[PDB]
Amino acid sequence: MNLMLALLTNFTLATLLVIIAFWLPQLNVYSEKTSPYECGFDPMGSARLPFSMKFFLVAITFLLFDLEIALLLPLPWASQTANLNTMLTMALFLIILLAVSLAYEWTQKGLE
Amino acid sequence: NPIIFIIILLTIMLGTIIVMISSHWLLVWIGFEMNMLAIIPIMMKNHNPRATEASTKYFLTQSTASMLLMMAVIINLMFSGQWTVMKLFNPMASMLMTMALAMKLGMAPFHFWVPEVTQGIPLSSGLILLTWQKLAPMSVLYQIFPSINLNLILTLSVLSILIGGWGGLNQTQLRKIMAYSSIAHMGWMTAVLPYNPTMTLLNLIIYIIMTSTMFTMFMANSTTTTLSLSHTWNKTPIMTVLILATLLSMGGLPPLSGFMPKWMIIQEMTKNNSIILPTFMAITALLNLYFYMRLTYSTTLTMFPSTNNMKMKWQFPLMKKMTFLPTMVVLSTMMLPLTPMLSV
Amino acid sequence: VAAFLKNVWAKEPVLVASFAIAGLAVILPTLSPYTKYSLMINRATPYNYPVPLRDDGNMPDVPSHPQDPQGPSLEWLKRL
Amino acid sequence: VELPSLEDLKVQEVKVSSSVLKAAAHHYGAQCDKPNKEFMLCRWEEKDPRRCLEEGKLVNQCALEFFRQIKRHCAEPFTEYWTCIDYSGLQLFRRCRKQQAQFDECVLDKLGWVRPDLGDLSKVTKVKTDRPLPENPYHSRARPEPNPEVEGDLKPARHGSRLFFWTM
Amino acid sequence: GRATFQFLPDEARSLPPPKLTDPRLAFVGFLGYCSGLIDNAIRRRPVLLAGLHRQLLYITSFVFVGYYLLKRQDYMYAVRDHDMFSYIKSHPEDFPEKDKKTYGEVFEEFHPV
Amino acid sequence: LLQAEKDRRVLQMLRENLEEEATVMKDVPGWKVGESVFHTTRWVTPMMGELYGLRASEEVLSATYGFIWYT
Amino acid sequence: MMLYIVFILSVIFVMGFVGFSSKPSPIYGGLGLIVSGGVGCGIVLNFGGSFLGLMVFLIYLGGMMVVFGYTTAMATEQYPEIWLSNKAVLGAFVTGLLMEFFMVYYVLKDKEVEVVFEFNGLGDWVIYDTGDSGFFSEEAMGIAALYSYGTWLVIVTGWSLLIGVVVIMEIT
Amino acid sequence: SMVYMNIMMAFTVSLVGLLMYRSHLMSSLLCLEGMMLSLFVMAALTILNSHFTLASMMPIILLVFAACEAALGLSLLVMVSNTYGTDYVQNLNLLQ
Amino acid sequence: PFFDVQKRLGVDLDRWMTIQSAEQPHKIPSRCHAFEKEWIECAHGIGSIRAEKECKIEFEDFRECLLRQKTMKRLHAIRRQREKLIKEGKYTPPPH
């Protein structure tokens, strides 16, 4: 029953330590002028974040290579079986189904 | 590019062959889950600001359509805990099957869709492929066939063949006019379905042919009704006797084959001593005919040939298997008391 | 063609080390006779509990006392 | 339902820890096999471990005299043997390997036992049939009756398809 | 029926077969013989008799296929019947023998004008 | 051996969870002593709620959740 | 740490949703999930299924969501907001929250009320186990690795993914 | 017992006004990609509390598409707001 | 239309995961396993349209093995035979 005793112990030191740092001098009596001088060294910066694509694909591109290496995960439990040939013949398919899915897209990464 | 377009366009039917071949509820998920995955790029090809505001109104309307099903698969995994494919053992399953499956076919409601997609897909080439998705689902309903609440599958039917009928009388674009009156013929085949479920397929094949041979004809340039006026005095008149030898046969008149489904279907729906149902269907497909008349008063009346329009060239499209179909879309009535005993 | 195979190895000698290992792991499992030992060991590990069958007449083999002569030789491994 | 009384209960359970219970545990079963394999067959062969309690007191019994045996001859090497294996985690058998002889010095020798290395708990054995081999399987209510078949000698169609008119 | 996904089983040996000169087989490919004549006319052939190599190979196709298909149709109406009598024969309790009697017995309505 | 210890532990366990039930009340709109919730008759391994009653204090919590979350 | 530590997770889970099932300015949408996903992977880690729980962290909650969050800088909303501050979002909330609460109140606040909510007893986890057992990797989903019997189940999923990229190499 | 009525009230997450609407489509698409876990967990119990031992892979296959496919339909939502910059379900243009 | 190819030729596509009792690789059972081989034995030579009005007995308890739907109610109704009377005598049990 002692796991949650070992988790909420950990946060409660951390969720404590924000206030004893952030908050404690935050109410101190120093000046702290409201002037809009903050947001350093790009003073104003008025724009939307524009869509920039080769930022985007490197999200998608991963998400799919991700899946099957969940599918690929239960090899070391499956190395203990009865008929094993249906493993080696089958196990090696996923991989090559992964590696193929590279080679195609590999004609165009662009600047990744 | 050109190879894969035959890899994609092959994987579709492989998406629907695992549907008809399977014993196992999971596979009929995966089965038509990978259409909504593998259909989408076909819409695209010319990358326009409709297809992309089309297939996204399609997508999330076949996304839930599926994703409810998986909720009505896992209900009767609780009760009886035996998958396979048979009556659903529990009423919250079926009522969550059939009226959430009517989304892919769309029936009486669940169509604000079929006109929003079929219209304005920039690709009219086909769009004949939206005759697959009529053929994936039915290949469930034939199996589950002895479980339905039976007060529903008629209540989506009879509110359909009506609502798809009136839908078009107001229409001009002739991609819509086929979009409409393709809800209609989903009124006959799932109205039958609890009584003797073959003599449905009969209406299913006679439908796949007739709507098929329309499009292949609508492919030369043809788009808007008033571009089918500039047709006979320009392209070829042997085309016009065709478009009048079908559009009439498709609502149907007894010397043609379009009369073949009704003529047989009512042999079935009476003999079960329901004679107050079929008239209202029988009589409502009537004002389903007044699209086609008044479509057919466009092309034989020599209406203001377009302008000085001189097409001296010959044709090089693919008419493939059009030189057959309106000898089988018309003349087959004289032939067959097979269709009830052939596919059975 | 060997001039090619030496003129990709002056430029990208990287993936070539992957192909060189890509095959050579596919080929060999159909060769060395050490394999198929691998399938015998892995079948004989008693995960479950052996249940004694009923003996009326035959009873081909395998007497009541296990250490008596009973059945196959698995001790080709113990010496291995 | 019928359950036996509170009686033929409160019997003598072998009360020992789980470290000693795996100490010998090995010479134990390979040499006994008088009730126990047979006692399985009073379960697997016929289920409902209620109808079969009897050998349960036989198989529980074999242990009693076993640990009662060993206490007479040598408990000294045993007591020291299951101490190491009881020095703990996982209860490995590969730490106490040295002392394995000291326990087994005269046990296999004096009172005449043997080390049943890999042949124990394998080589699916047999027992014997003493109790009636039960018919009337577990639940087993009724058949019920199937469909009479159809083959005969056939025909072509009688008058030809009898649809509406459509002679042939 | 049985031997599933067979165009026709081995049991169709005992049927006539449907040999030629039946009006349909002639008619089959007639509707193709009026098909061929179309095949020219769409493109502005403008022959109305064009190459006999297109103006034939249709008629060859239909009647072959029309034939090769009629061989099973007639079959199917036989296996339909076959499975009926053999059921009608047994369960005679579901199949009475009606008696014989009419005149001097039955009254009708009797409503003249 | 190990099993022939358990089967006795549950049959002992049902009786006390019956004999100490049937002596709670015998009610006229009550239940017969030790009926069956099924029609069929054979020995079907009982549900946790059978062995431990509404007792539901601690030694239960160390039974059902005993193995999970830790040694 | 009572016997109710399961029932206390789900009713946080059920409340995990209604945060983002209304309309929260979807940079807080995530924070309606990773709580729900978290507590979700929480519930599953009871019952004995473990491997299958600890994956949702790896394959979905950890891996997937980040893409859902790596965008919504590309679709980036104009000037985000703390949800429930508004009058548009706040109105829809509570009536959901109470609807299970008022359900959860007299669902059983008494002996039974009434029938349809009365056939679910509580508190011992009556079903939550059976008897004892032996061990295989555990017993249950301990053996989730079948490259034996399952094959035609993989080779569709194995092949259906390979096309996932081709579709997306285009429209991109 | 009770854990089957939660989570179920959770699987009415559909709620459809909040399934297509209102704008910030990303909120709609969101409650979709989390419509799972109501399908998953619910089917990670009934499989588990009784030992099926076999369908146990099915939970895995309920994600592997639910991520694969729902990650597709994200793509379009770039094409919409690429040409715009605001998703805003309020684009109707193709009409009927 | 359901072709059933895996009947004609030899392959097994699925047919194994299908029901609650088939193999379970190490031969480990389910809880309600023993009622399958009971209930399938009932309707096999049947054509299933009379099954519903024929067997129905071996099915119902099987549905009541699965969910424990009733035994949980007759159980919850011991909490009303005791634990309204706690003060009125027969604490029940004596501990231990």
Ligand SMILES: CCCCCCCCCCCCCCCCCC(=O)OC[C@H](COP(=O)(O)OCCN)OC(=O)CCCCCCCCCCCCCCCCC
């Ligand atoms: C039969 C059995 C099989 C037989 C196989 C035979 C042998 C095959 C095995 C070889 C594989 C070794 C590892 C893989 C190859 C090394 C990785 C590689 O390919 O680097 C290629 C890199 C590309 O550079 P280039 O193509 O020239 O383009 C730039 C031009 N301006 O060119 C480079 O040089 C990049 C260098 C690395 C980049 C990072 C280096 C940063 C410093 C880190 C070094 C520390 C690592 C040392 C290892 C510590 C180990 C404890």
